[PDB]
């Protein structure tokens, strides 16, 4: 069964030798499964997003750091000042909400288009992001012949990565409300929303429009070390105590235990 630590260098060894179908192979490799000790991916063919939750120091930030490292491996740099990508390569652009500033250097400025650490910064950044996403569709009222001619928007894959979403205001106040309309058609606008939240008060966190939209889109939910007392999370599954880095990867009614690939974060600040 699963080890207490499995490095990202280790999962990459496995990913380069994995040709399994229907698991998102060739994509972001961020964990290994309890079932077969094989890689677990962000299967963008199934879903564009990911939610991660768990109690204090379960490994939420490290999970994002591993995913970001994978983005750097699999994608050409897609920030505005980055060079044109090598032929055949997809491009990735990161929009980072990181209040505790732990993920600022997981990727260089050739990947990170915008990052925000204060509320005003988040509000401003989300406005810019929404404007870019709104442009990713054809002009209205074109003929069939016109629509056939080309792809009408161009640009890199956009990763909206948010650590510690619990620190943001909930409700309609939420700065993330401008990105909500794109969640359901994320694949068509090349959007990926990856968010973490502390497990405390999880069932009462539906009040966040982004978390609600992600649940409505049936995004994968990794429930790391957690408390059964919060009740059922998805279907008949409750959260439970787990070693650090380990989580129950939930769909709607089913789940599988995984061990998240570890990577270094110089930056870890827990406010002890
Ligand atoms: N995948 C992992 N495998 C093994 N250990 C891990 C893993 N992820 C995190 N840890 C360990 O757990 C500790 C906390 O890491 P991290 O800061 O990522 O957690 P966190 O949940 O974000 O914490 P916080 O609650 O402060 O946000 C660190 O010591 C880290 O080494
Ligand atoms: Mg953290």
Residue numbers in the entry: 1125 to 1396
Paper quotes:
EccC, the motor subunit of T7SS, is essential to assemble a stable membrane complex for the secretion process. It contains a two-pass transmembrane domain, an unknown function domain (DUF), and three Fts-SpoIIIE-like ATPase domains (ATPase1, ATPase2, and ATPase3). In this study, we have provided high-resolution crystal structures of ATPase3 domains of EccC proteins from Mtb, all in complex with ATP.
To explain structure-function differences amongst EccC-ATPase3 domains, the crystal structures of Mtb ATPase3 from ESX-2, -3, -5 were determined at 2.20 Å, 1.97 Å and 2.00 Å resolution, respectively. The second is the loop connecting ɑ1 and β4 (V2), which is extremely long in EccC5-ATPase3. Here, our structural data showed that the recognition pocket in each EccC-ATPase3 is different. The signal binding pocket of MtEccC3-ATPase3 is much wider than MtEccCb1-ATPase3; the pocket of MtEccC5-ATPase3 is much flatter while MtEccC2-ATPase3 has a shallow recognition pocket. Thus, a hexameric model for EccCb1-ATPase3 can be proposed based on the hexamer structure of FtsK ATPase domain through superposition. Indeed, this is similar to what we observed in the packing of our EccC5-ATPase3 crystal structure which has six-fold screw axis symmetry. Similar to FtsK, the protruding segment between ɑ2 and β5 interacts with the loop between β4 and ɑ2 of the neighboring subunit.
